[PDB]
Amino acid sequence: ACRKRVKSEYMRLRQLKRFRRADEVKSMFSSNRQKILERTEILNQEWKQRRIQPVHILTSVSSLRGTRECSVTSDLDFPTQVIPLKTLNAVASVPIMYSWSPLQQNFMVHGDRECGFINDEIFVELVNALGQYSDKIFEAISSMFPDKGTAEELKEKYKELTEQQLPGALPPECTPNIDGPNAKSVQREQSLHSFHTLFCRRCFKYDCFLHFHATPNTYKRKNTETALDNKPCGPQCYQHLEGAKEFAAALTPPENVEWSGAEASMFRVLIGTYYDNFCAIARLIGTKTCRQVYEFRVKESSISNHVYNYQPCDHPRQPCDSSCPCVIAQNFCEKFCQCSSECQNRFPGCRCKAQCNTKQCPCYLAVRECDPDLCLTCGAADHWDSKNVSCKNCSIQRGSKKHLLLAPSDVAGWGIFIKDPVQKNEFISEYCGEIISQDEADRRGKVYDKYMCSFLFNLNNDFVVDATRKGNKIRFANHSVNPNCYAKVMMVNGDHRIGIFAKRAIQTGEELFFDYRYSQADALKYVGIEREMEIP
Amino acid sequence: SEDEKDPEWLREKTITQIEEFSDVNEGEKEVMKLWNLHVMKHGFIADNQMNHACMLFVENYGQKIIKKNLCRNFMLHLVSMHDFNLISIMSIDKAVTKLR
Amino acid sequence: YSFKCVNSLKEDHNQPLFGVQFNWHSKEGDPLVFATVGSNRVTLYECHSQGEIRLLQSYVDADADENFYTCAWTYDSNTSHPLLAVAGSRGIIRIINPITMQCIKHYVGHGNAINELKFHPRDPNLLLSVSKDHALRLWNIQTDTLVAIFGGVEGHRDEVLSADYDLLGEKIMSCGMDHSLKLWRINSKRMMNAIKESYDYNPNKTNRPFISQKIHFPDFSTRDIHRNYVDCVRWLGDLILSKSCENAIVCWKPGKMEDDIDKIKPSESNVTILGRFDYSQCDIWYMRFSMDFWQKMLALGNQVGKLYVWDLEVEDPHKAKCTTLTHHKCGAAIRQTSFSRDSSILIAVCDDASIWRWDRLR
Numbered sequence: 002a003c004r005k006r007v008k009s010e011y012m013r014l015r016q017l018k019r020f021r022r023a024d025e026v027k028s029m030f031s032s033n034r035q036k037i038l039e040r041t042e043i044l045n046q047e048w049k050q051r052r053i054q055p056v057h058i059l060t061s062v063s064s065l066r067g068t069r070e071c072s073v074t075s076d077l078d079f080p081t082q083v084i085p086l087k088t089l090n091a092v093a094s095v096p097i098m099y100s101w102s103p104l105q106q107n108f109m110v111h112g113d114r115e116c117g118f119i120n121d122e123i124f125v126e127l128v129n130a131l132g133q134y135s136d137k138i139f140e141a142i143s144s145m146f147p148d149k150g151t152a153e154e155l156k157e158k159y160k161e162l163t164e165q166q167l168p169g170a171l172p173p174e175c176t177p178n179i180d181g182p183n184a185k186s187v188q189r190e191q192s193l194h195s196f197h198t199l200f201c202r203r204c205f206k207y208d209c210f211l212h213f214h215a216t217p218n219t220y221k222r223k224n225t226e227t228a229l230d231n232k233p234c235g236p237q238c239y240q241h242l243e244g245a246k247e248f249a250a251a252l253t254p255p256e257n258v259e260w261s262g263a264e265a266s267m268f269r270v271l272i273g274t275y276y277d278n279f280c281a282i283a284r285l286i287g288t289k290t291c292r293q294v295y296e297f298r299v300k301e302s303s304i305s306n307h308v309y310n311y312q313p314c315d316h317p318r319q320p321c322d323s324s325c326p327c328v329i330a331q332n333f334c335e336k337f338c339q340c341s342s343e344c345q346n347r348f349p350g351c352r353c354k355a356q357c358n359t360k361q362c363p364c365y366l367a368v369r370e371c372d373p374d375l376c377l378t379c380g381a382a383d384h385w386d387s388k389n390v391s392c393k394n395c396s397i398q399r400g401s402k403k404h405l406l407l408a409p410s411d412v413a414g415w416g417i418f419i420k421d422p423v424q425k426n427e428f429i430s431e432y433c434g435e436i437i438s439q440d441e442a443d444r445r446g447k448v449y450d451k452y453m454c455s456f457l458f459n460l461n462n463d464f465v466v467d468a469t470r471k472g473n474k475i476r477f478a479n480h481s482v483n484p485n486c487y488a489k490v491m492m493v494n495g496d497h498r499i500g501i502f503a504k505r506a507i508q509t510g511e512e513l514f515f516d517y518r519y520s521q522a523d524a525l526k527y528v529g530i531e532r533e534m535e536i537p
Numbered sequence: 538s539e540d541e542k543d544p545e546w547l548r549e550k551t552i553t554q555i556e557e558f559s560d561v562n563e564g565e566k567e568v569m570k571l572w573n574l575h576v577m578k579h580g581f582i583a584d585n586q587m588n589h590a591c592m593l594f595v596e597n598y599g600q601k602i603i604k605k606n607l608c609r610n611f612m613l614h615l616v617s618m619h620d621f622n623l624i625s626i627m628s629i630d631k632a633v634t635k636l637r
Numbered sequence: 638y639s640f641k642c643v644n645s646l647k648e649d650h651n652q653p654l655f656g657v658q659f660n661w662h663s664k665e666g667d668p669l670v671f672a673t674v675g676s677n678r679v680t681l682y683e684c685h686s687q688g689e690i691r692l693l694q695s696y697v698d699a700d701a702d703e704n705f706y707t708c709a710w711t712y713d714s715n716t717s718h719p720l721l722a723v724a725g726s727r728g729i730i731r732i733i734n735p736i737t738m739q740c741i742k743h744y745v746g747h748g749n750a751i752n753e754l755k756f757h758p759r760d761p762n763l764l765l766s767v768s769k770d771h772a773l774r775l776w777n778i779q780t781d782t783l784v785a786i787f788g789g790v791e792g793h794r795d796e797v798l799s800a801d802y803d804l805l806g807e808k809i810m811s812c813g814m815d816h817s818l819k820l821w822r823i824n825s826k827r828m829m830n831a832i833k834e835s836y837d838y839n840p841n842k843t844n845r846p847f848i849s850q851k852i853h854f855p856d857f858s859t860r861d862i863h864r865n866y867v868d869c870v871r872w873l874g875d876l877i878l879s880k881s882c883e884n885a886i887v888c889w890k891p892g893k894m895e896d897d898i899d900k901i902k903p904s905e906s907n908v909t910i911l912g913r914f915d916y917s918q919c920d921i922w923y924m925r926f927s928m929d930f931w932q933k934m935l936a937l938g939n940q941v942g943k944l945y946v947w948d949l950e951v952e953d954p955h956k957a958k959c960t961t962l963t964h965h966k967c968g969a970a971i972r973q974t975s976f977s978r979d980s981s982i983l984i985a986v987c988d989d990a991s992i993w994r995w996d997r998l999r
């Protein structure tokens with residue numbers, strides 16, 4: 002009888018939850034106001050403390066009798082009054098500039114249908130079996146009206162419920178840090194995987210700002226790093242039978258003491274570094290003496306140029322064939338590229354010996370600087386902290402930023418100068434900014450064109466550099482068709498840069514100029530001014 | 538001059554960029570944040586520079602790591618760069634011996 | 638609940654009018670004042686019985702012919718004199734002392750133009766300036782120094798005009814044209830110190846200037862709240878009052894109801910909605926209103942001169958006690974309104990260089 006009626010009201014229970022939205026609104030509408038009453042008087046209380054001077058009306062001024070006076074009337078019947086207007090002090094007409102952040106680097110860039118249910122599968126047979134004229138029918142019953150998910154849709158929704166109970170609070174694959182008192186015995190591949198994923202070789206750090214690109218960090222050097230075999234290199238270390246010397250290669254007086262599971266977490270990490278050092282493994286972590294560390298280990302063992310963007314072009318087994326990306330990009334197969342020195346697109350380096358930025362030098366002749374390991378002959382790696390080296394193709398590498406002086410330019414708003422005199426072709430800091438893709442450059446270009454701004458430059462055939470929201474000082478320098486300086490694109494170990502150099506001998510106090518090299522619409526609309534006098 | 542190796546705001550930018558990882562522990566996170574922050578603070582790019590960076594990371598702020606007691610993550614951090622062919626065996630023991 | 642118009646005025650320069658604020662920097666019994674700022678004109682008014690109004694001091698600016706639309710009450714804690722800090726479309730801040738009847742103080746450095754001026758509720762010497770640069774500029778008026786800068790890089794993606802002060806000045810708010818909701822604490826340890834050394838400076842002390850601070854991380858952010866132009870945001874304790882150009886005033890607090898405002902994190906973006914106040918024909922920007930000193934009743938003006946009134950007592954937007962005050966003569970616009978320090982006097986701005994003053998029927 003009432004079985005079905007009690008069932009009949011079961012799926013109508015959702016409408017009761019509709020008015021629960023306003024359950025606690027009035028309660029908090031009282032708490033906040035109560036606190037407001039406390040705060041408002043306190044400020045008023047302080048306002049009671051400080052005496053305040055009244056107002057004073059104007060008067061006729063002997064030196065300003067004829068000051069121009071405005072008149073204010075009343076929209077209503079009130080009288081009309083006329084009082085003079087005393088002009089305020091002079092204000093300096095200052096040119097306009099737009100907010101930013103100091104950037105010294107280059108960085109890559111209501112429906113009518115809803116869902117919900119109740120997980121009462123225990124009692125749905127009370128709903129159906131004990132409520133017919135069973136449990137699985139909840140998916141179907143919830144599915145007639147489009148206000149809830151369909152019978153199948155609820156099944157994935159219930160799969161979320163099991164994925165909502167879950168084990169303890171932790172990401173499914175991450176492991177606690179070893180420094181933590183709950184250090185686990187996570188093996189080398191799993192533990193280093195977090196380091197593997199986060200690390201980035203190009204800028205030799207973790208999670209490079211300026212760089213989904215990933216490579217397996219298997220390294221093509223010799224497979225092992227063996228140190229010592231069957232020898233007492235430690236203060237007291239095993240030798241045993243010497244037939245194990247080949248066995249260690251083939252795998253590729255006993256005594257003992259206790260151990261701990263936590264210390265074993267790094268023990269077979271140590272065997273991943275040397276694989277046979279009986280002593281350094283004991284030196285770092287071990288509950289056994291350097292004698293017995295072998296005993297623990299043995300049972301453990303028994304248990305035509307430029308244009309495109311650089312890329313570490315790959316060919317793991319095959320040589321640098323057509324599948325080698327550098328064949329397509331038309332540039333070098335650098336050390337990061339999977340070509341060896343055998344691969345003919347290997348770059349030799351900065352082969353100079355005396356000066357490695359001179360007219361006849363591969364650094365200066367080509368578009369590439371000298372890496373510290375390239376003109377080692379001329380001290381490219383000589384005291385990077387020190388600024389005195391014969392290799393001048395390291396200024397950006399050593400970050401020898403110039404002293405740029407912000408100033409206001411009659412040509413356009415503000416401008417940039419230099420503190421020290423600079424002769425022809427000396428360094429000026431790089432146009433530090435952000436590297437965006439071509440498509441967003443189209444998006445940002447029209448945005449910048451919409452706001453009539455100029456901080457965008459095409460990096461190469463593959464990318465475009467932006468320095469609008471974050472940039473360096475030189476982005477505030479003006480332009481001249483007859484500039485005193487120039488911008489020249491630089492390469493750094495497969496990274497696109499741009500060097501700024503003075504065209505002529507220049508003393509302190511000269512404004513900086515260059516050419517944006519923009520589209521025709523971009524040029525005239527922005528730099529169609531050159532400050533020339535016409536007599537006739 | 539305002540010409541320094543790193544503006545102050547960038548330090549917390551990567552701090553936010555590192556800390557956002559819901560899948561990375563705090564012990565490893567804090568060390569690498571400390572490890573990130575010194576690298577641009579000195580601007581060392583060469584392999585020996587990276588070797589010189591580690592000996593400068595210790596004995597200057599590795600005591601803070603000792604103060605933070607975040608060693609075991611750092612030791613795995615030290616072997617990581619070793620296995621990343623940037624650091625030799627002789628360098629990793631210097632940090633090990635400095636604590637001990 | 639009780640507000641009728643018994644007074645009105647109109648001046649001669651015909652420019653669309655700008656913000657007006659009542660002298661809450663007064664005493665209960667002293668002559669309470671309200672000022673008015675024009676594009677290049679600034680003036681004040683006095684409220685008298687029987688609806689009478691007398692025009693107070695009036696000044697003009699012919700040299701810098703750009704709009705002046707931002708003002709903030711100023712008071713001298715030392716000499717017990719009130720003032721008024723004004724700024725416009727060039728970013729230069731001018732301070733007026735009616736007793737001195739002259740403007741002598743230098744405040745330049747703003748990027749494009751200032752679109753808000755406000756002072757700290759306690760400190761009468763610290764001015765809040767908001768920029769269309771998406772950055773927040775701060776000046777210590779008495780020391781003439783530059784206080785820390787907000788929103789240099791991590792600010793709103795579009796222009797910012799509106800902000801608010803809690804009565805403690807614990808935090809500061811940013812709500813840009815991009816409908817985002819960005820908040821910065823003022824109770825930061827770095828912030829509080831920089832406030833202290835702002836008063837600690839001497840030109841002959843050091844060659845170095847007062848080292849300002851760049852702060853960029855906003856303690857909260859949300860964008861799905863407003864689908865249309867946002868131009869008005871307020872604070873109600875831990876609540877975020879807001880008005881957009883969508884004919885709907887809305888208030889909310891971040892995250893759950895139980896979430897305290899002072900413990901929120903920048904990465905959080907959850908918002909639970911609890912307010913709604915729709916209106917009509919006010920779907921444009923340049924629209925600002927007033928809130929009483931006690932923060933109890935509001936006067937929402939309209940471009941057709943209509944005034945929408947709603948109380949913030951236990952009576953909530955859930956019932957939305959309605960009062961659509963209106964006057965027939967004004968139909969141009971209402972750029973700003975001004976509740977007095979008391980609730981008795983109300984001032985409404987009509988765009989054709991005209992004013993309409995309403996009085997509470999207490």
Ligand SMILES: Nc1ncnc2c1ncn2[C@@H]1O[C@H](CSCC[C@H](N)C(=O)O)[C@@H](O)[C@H]1O
Nearest residue numbers: 413414415453454455477478479480527528
């Ligand atoms: N050489 C030039 N002459 C006139 N206007 C220029 C200019 N170079 C850039 N501009 C304008 O200035 C804007 C960028 S600001 C760059 C100009 C100047 N260096 C300064 O700091 O103010 C662009 O929108 C462009 O329209």
